[PDB]
Amino acid sequence: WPAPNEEQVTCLKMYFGHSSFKPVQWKVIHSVLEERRDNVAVMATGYGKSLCFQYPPVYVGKIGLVISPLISLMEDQVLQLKMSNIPACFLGSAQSENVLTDIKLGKYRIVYVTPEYCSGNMGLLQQLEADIGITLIAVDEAHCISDFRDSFRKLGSLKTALPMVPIVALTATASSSIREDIVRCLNLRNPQITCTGFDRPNLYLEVRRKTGNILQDLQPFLVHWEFEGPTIIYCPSRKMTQQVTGELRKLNLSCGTYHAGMSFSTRKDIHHRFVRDEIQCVIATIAFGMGINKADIRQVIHYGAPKDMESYYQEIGRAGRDGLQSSCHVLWAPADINLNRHLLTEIRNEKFRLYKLKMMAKMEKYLHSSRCRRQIILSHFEDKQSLGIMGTEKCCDNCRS
Ligand SMILES: Nc1ncnc2c1ncn2[C@@H]1O[C@H](COP(=O)(O)OP(=O)(O)OP(O)(O)=S)[C@@H](O)[C@H]1O
């Protein structure tokens, strides 16, 4: 593996603020720049997935095409890139002809599009490749889920229209059948397969039981009444989020409810007030998670047994992005496990339904285990990826008993 040169490190430092690449970020970045190779990367939350697709076009001063149906989330990335002096924009049918002209003139490093826009605009992408050059196409499977196979099927012609352009496909699951469905839908040619599973040593892990009274359960975390710091309380349902918000509001707590059933403006308001610390706690479903852009989330409380080990690992990685000590508590009851099995029936892919079932069995072992919670989670990664935090009072509840 060739090491990054000084021109590469200077670019990384001035446009991204990082003094070095992480091993898999460089494996992906270098593979795109030098080999023009397709990539499938299993991304652990908090690792650094955005650098993998944003850095290569910024370095060579060309275009990176980013494909996702989540337009408002993509427009937040545009504003963040703007603050780093990286010209970026979202391109669609509502988006002006002056922006399209500037895209064709090579004025933007990163262009965000939806899979549907991409489907009827292969001629434009061939012109952009011919006139400026497309360093890479990026698509995250975790963004196309509401079934990524129908969004990714609209992207099957990308490889025939642009055979020289590498596709970097990201995934939030280590499922081998999902990786092979991504390789088929996108028609990837010998992609580099990477996994970024890592320990988050600044997150303390705990599993605890629900007493049968919301205020009784959430009282220990309260120190007027207030939480220790910015908190997210995850609930299995929209109704559960309103019930918890109601109980917390009896103690005049700075609260905001968040679920996918809420309107765009209402959700955007709760999200922004959380970032500005106008609310201290978000009682949410897992709809609140992607691009929170809040570094100081101190506490994640899963109010209900997590659906499975993989998704729980991904959800807690949203806490403590600043590197300071954070806590992740599970408050569960046996009845939740019966209700969690009902969500496996709504998984259409049979090969993934069997993978999620294994992940659910691992979550059940975790909830009933007396062994180090961190050791159970790390038992899915390379023996390199921790004896430091492990065994100490900051590791997990089981290490303290
Ligand atoms: N090379 C790096 N060195 C240090 N920190 C890094 C590096 N790459 C990324 N990070 C940090 O890793 C964290 C996660 O980055 P990303 O995965 O790009 O975040 P994201 O795309 O906003 O993901 P979500 O939506 O919040 S899971 C951010 O705080 C980055 O600044």
Ligand SMILES: *CCC(=O)Nc1nn(Cc2ccc(F)cc2)c2c(C)cccc12
């Ligand atoms: C290739 C090694 C690797 O990083 N593997 C990997 N497995 N998983 C699934 C997982 C991890 C931890 C856990 F507690 C349950 C399930 C990964 C995820 C979820 C992301 C990135 C890499 C992962």
Ligand SMILES: [Zn+2]
């Ligand atoms: Zn431990």
